[PDB]
Amino acid sequence: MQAEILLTLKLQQKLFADPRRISLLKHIALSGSISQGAKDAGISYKSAWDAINEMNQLSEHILVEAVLTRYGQRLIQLYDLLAQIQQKAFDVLSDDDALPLNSLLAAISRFSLQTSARNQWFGTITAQHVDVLLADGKTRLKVAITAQSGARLGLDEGKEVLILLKAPWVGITQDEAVAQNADNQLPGIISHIERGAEQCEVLMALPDGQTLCATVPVNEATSLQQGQNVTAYFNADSVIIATLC
Amino acid sequence: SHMQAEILLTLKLQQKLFADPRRISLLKHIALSGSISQGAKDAGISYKSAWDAINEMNQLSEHILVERATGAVLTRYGQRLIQLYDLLAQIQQKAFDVLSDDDALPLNSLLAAISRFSLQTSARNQWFGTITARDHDDVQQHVDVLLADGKTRLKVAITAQSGARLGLDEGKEVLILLKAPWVGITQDEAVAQNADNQLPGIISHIERGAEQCEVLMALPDGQTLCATVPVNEATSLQQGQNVTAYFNADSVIIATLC
Ligand code: NI
Numbered sequence: 345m346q347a348e349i350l351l352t353l354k355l356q357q358k359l360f361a362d363p364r365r366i367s368l369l370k371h372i373a374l375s376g377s378i379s380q381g382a383k384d385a386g387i388s389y390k391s392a393w394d395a396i397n398e399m400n401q402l403s404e405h406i407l408v409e410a411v412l413t414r415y416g417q418r419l420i421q422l423y424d425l426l427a428q429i430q431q432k433a434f435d436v437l438s439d440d441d442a443l444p445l446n447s448l449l450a451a452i453s454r455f456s457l458q459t460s461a462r463n464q465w466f467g468t469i470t471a472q473h474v475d476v477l478l479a480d481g482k483t484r485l486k487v488a489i490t491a492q493s494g495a496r497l498g499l500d501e502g503k504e505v506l507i508l509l510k511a512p513w514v515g516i517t518q519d520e521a522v523a524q525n526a527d528n529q530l531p532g533i534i535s536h537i538e539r540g541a542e543q544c545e546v547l548m549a550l551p552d553g554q555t556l557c558a559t560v561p562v563n564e565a566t567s568l569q570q571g572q573n574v575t576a577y578f579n580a581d582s583v584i585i586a587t588l589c
Numbered sequence: 590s591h592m593q594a595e596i597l598l599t600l601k602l603q604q605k606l607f608a609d610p611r612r613i614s615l616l617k618h619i620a621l622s623g624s625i626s627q628g629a630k631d632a633g634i635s636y637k638s639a640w641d642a643i644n645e646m647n648q649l650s651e652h653i654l655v656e657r658a659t660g661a662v663l664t665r666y667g668q669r670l671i672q673l674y675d676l677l678a679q680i681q682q683k684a685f686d687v688l689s690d691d692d693a694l695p696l697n698s699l700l701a702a703i704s705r706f707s708l709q710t711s712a713r714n715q716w717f718g719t720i721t722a723r724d725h726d727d728v729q730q731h732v733d734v735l736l737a738d739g740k741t742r743l744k745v746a747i748t749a750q751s752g753a754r755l756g757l758d759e760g761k762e763v764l765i766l767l768k769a770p771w772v773g774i775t776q777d778e779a780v781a782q783n784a785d786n787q788l789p790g791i792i793s794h795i796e797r798g799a800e801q802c803e804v805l806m807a808l809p810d811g812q813t814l815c816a817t818v819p820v821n822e823a824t825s826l827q828q829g830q831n832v833t834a835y836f837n838a839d840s841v842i843i844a845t846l847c
Contacts, residue, residue, distance in 0.1 A: 347603075348600075349598060349600055351596070351598055352598075353597070353685065354594070355595070360594070415688070421695060422681070422687075422688055426681060444665075444669070447707060449707035453703050453707065453708070453846070457844060458845060458846075459755075459766070459844045460745070460751050460752075460843040460844075489711045496709055584710055584712050584842060585710065585711045586708060586709065586710040586711070588703070588708055589709065
């Protein structure tokens, strides 16, 4: 379904920007002149001046110096942003199976935003740190974070969070006495071990479905076997937690 | 920081005008009033143009926006259209404030909009940048990142595989998520000269606490670096002090859209 968005900006109750003025600016950038610009954009020369002069006055910047100033370019960038996201916005709107729309930036960023952390899990703030319940419903974590960063992330009971944990920040132990003194403990079964000259990648099947990745010094992985039940452990302050609002 | 823009959006579907200010305003007054006719009158539009608008919006969207109360109410879709419109308008208003205030991120970038307006993380550093050419002919397991001045360079560790999957080719936009306690702050160049990454600067703000001192410095592109250093190790620091921030390449997590 063809779909588009048109934007008009008004300042002080008057007309500041509208597609025809943005097209005037872009034809000005292209042509290197106001008169050629107006012609390409389809308006009179005097009307191109009236628009540029009104824009300058209402915004209190200078938009055209012919070249555009920085302020002028970024005004076009603000239009280009809208045009970058419209099709995502229309797809969010037409999504008959979605729950109610809370945050359009969070909706368009839930499934596209990816990270380089090999462990990337979803959770909710359950009731200096916060506790997080993972999405398969049983696993709890403790995440070190001040009351104030918690406030800046919007950490309320139930807020969805993204939890990030590099593989080399994860310890792997077969000793319950080591694991029990860790902040976070995730029992699981080793499903793959890959031994290199300095490092060993461990993948572990967590009881509830996802696969945890740890990267440990090889000499610490010597007795480990695929099939074996072990415990992954990490400090509360190793985890990065993110929210989208 | 002054002057809020008034945002006027028009959505068009199938080459036709679908929703504009007047139509969204009609649907909110319908929701507020409980009826088409009181809602059209509150929105300042006649009864007939009100139903002409709703019949059109239904036909274009392939949904029903308004239905008789089981009195008129918005359906799920009528509510979703108003929500999406108003969130969209709010994103253009915040973008306008960015234009007015300035910053060095591109204002056309979606990742930069997410970073400014939606994403927050516990790491405290969340810098915008772009994948740039490796800075050595030899392949190493790291990407190079330029900050928004297109000049200040960082290295981040990652494998070719996770780099590939994330689409990390020249020009890809990423965020650098770097915990504050993993950032050093030094007045001694040699100390920092031993780390993968050094970012010179000036302390723009210092806060001291019993165990940790928080330091804030402007990166050369305007973005803000935050570091948390042991108060033992921060006793000689002060605002305006010229400083170098330093960190390992494997301390970073890269975020990017895929
Ligand atoms: Ni490099």
